[PDB]
Amino acid sequence: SGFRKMAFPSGKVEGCMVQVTCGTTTLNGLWLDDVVYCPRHVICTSEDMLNPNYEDLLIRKSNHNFLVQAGNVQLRVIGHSMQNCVLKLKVDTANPKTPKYKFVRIQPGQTFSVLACYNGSPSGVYQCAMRPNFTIKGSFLNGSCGSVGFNIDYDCVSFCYMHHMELPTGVHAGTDLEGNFYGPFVDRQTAQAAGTDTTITVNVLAWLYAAVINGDRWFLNRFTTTLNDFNLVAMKYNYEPLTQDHVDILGPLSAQTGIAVLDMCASLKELLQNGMNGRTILGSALLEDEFTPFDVVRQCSGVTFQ
Amino acid sequence: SGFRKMAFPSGKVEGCMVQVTCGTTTLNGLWLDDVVYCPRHVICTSEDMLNPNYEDLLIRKSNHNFLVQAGNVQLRVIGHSMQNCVLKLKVDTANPKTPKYKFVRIQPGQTFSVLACYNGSPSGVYQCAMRPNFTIKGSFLNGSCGSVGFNIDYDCVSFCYMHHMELPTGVHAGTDLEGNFYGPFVDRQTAQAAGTDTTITVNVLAWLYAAVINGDRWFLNRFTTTLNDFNLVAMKYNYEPLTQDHVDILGPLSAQTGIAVLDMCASLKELLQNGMNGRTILGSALLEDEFTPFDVVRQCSGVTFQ
């Protein structure tokens, strides 16, 4: 029993973190085989953040201008190139701790773990969702750039996020590991703002199923609803539409609890219209939307990773 | 900016997890140097859980009756002994991944990370507090016994918890790594219940400081209070007394924000008496008490570990 915001074990990623220094800027890089990946604005200086000419800044750098340290060992840079908003620094040593890995571009609504790092050293790990507005609600300080997000499946680390920017509402923006930003954001000091966010309905339903699995059932009512009638209510409360694909993805949780998805939707409708009236669900007084159906299954069935 | 329930990087502990099988029971063990630590009820059978005679059960086991596997490699057991509620299995191979480590008995109110494991394989990591009633609000399924809790300081892993039991309210009980239970609990199938819990006041204050650091300030009022008058209110709402030691431990956060502890206490008093009136603090509609002052400092200052 119990339900926690649980992150993936971080050890496979810890062995890949390095620090990259160029001039006065230091941030984190990801060392896989003989390549270090890091945000390209490691080459920027303070006066020139409004609209950096990255190609012009980089042509004045040579391999020796990049100082890469894995723990206390310097890694010699023997080549460099820019791909979208990342630098690829080729180094003279392949990381002996390189896990089996993939680069993935995740979809809004999916979750991942973040290994927050400073000066190439891990600080902590936590779980995040890719929000519908392509931001993440992270915990990042100065120096955290280049920290990565990831999922683990069996033995394979799927890297999905590299940290670049903090936006005005205290939320965060970054790229996939090919250096393409999630969302409309850019690596310049400009006016950029998160679009209006929405609530991830399929995840709220997954979490209500987690609550039932854990014995927290007070919110189940005797009614049902159609998908269309449910979505008219979801729309009013700034929830995203629920699709038939979402209903089918919730099938395993529906089968485990014996509660049809549309019956759970009827219970969620009443929570949206009436509130919780001072009660909690899984210890929260709000509806939680950063657990996917797969997250709930993993945590309520004990999925491990080699 | 941002504030998340952040766990320690788990890699140093991952390398220590093994599975222990005795008869039909399988659980997790902790492999440090040439010793594997695990809960002693790995030697129990289903019919004999009401009141096991552990000494009598163990005298009928030999080294070969314990099957210890580190990944896919069997570790030969060459000695065994019982210490309180744990078994120490001496093995023929010292763990080459043994970190610098300590065993610590933590105090109520302090936090730690849990590496939840099944069949010796890590599943996820999350942060827990030792509750005043000596339970933890974990997320544990069948097979999780022997999973450990820990803190990391610089390079040293301080192990503080090994998982044994689930109590009726869906909360958890376990031991330090010397096998002494936290709280009055025992490893038998009996009537045991968590005592009434209380809220960890110094942690709530730490979290209110985290909120201010992050720009969430609406709850700050213009008043102050004495320590005694504050504690009369805390008592009514089932908060633990705030001590002068607690006030001093909050000193760094008070200095960083410029808000005297007793002034923050005045703001907390008003939140207890009036509620939040529909507002959130750091994204929560409840007051959070599982961040210590040190946790807040770590997360809002970027402490890393080698």
Ligand SMILES: *[C@@](O)(c1nc2ccccc2s1)[C@H](C[C@@H]1CCCNC1=O)NC(=O)[C@@H]1Cc2ccccc2CN1C(=O)[C@@H](NC(=O)C(F)(F)F)C(C)(C)C
């Ligand atoms: C990350 O650690 C980096 N810092 C630097 C410093 C100098 C050069 C390159 C880099 S990367 C840091 C992480 C931030 C820091 C604030 C606290 N929380 C975080 O997540 N990124 C950072 O400061 C980026 C880097 C960058 C790159 C190119 C142009 C401008 C900037 C500034 N920047 C921002 O995040 C800024 N936000 C925006 O401009 C906005 F997204 F449009 F809002 C800001 C510094 C937070 C205002």
Ligand SMILES: *[C@@](O)(c1nc2ccccc2s1)[C@H](C[C@@H]1CCCNC1=O)NC(=O)[C@@H]1Cc2ccccc2CN1C(=O)[C@@H](NC(=O)C(F)(F)F)C(C)(C)C
């Ligand atoms: C842990 O994984 C173990 N399972 C077994 C099974 C056979 C032998 C030894 C062990 S250790 C398991 C973790 C639990 C399981 C339920 C779901 N969540 C968890 O955290 N521990 C476990 O089942 C313990 C082990 C034990 C040891 C000696 C006597 C009796 C038991 C049963 N037990 C309990 O946790 C039980 N709780 C209590 O008896 C109570 F604490 F008094 F409430 C119960 C099985 C949850 C009812």
Ligand code: NA
């Ligand atoms: Na219903």
Ligand code: NA
């Ligand atoms: Na005040």
